[PDB]
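Researcher: Checking consistency across runs. Here is dal-leu-gly-cys-thr again:
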Amino acid sequence: XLGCT
């Protein structure tokens, strides 16, 4: 979920 939504 680093840069993911």
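Researcher: Does this match what you'd expect to see?
Model: One thing to look at in this run: The chain has no helices and no strands.
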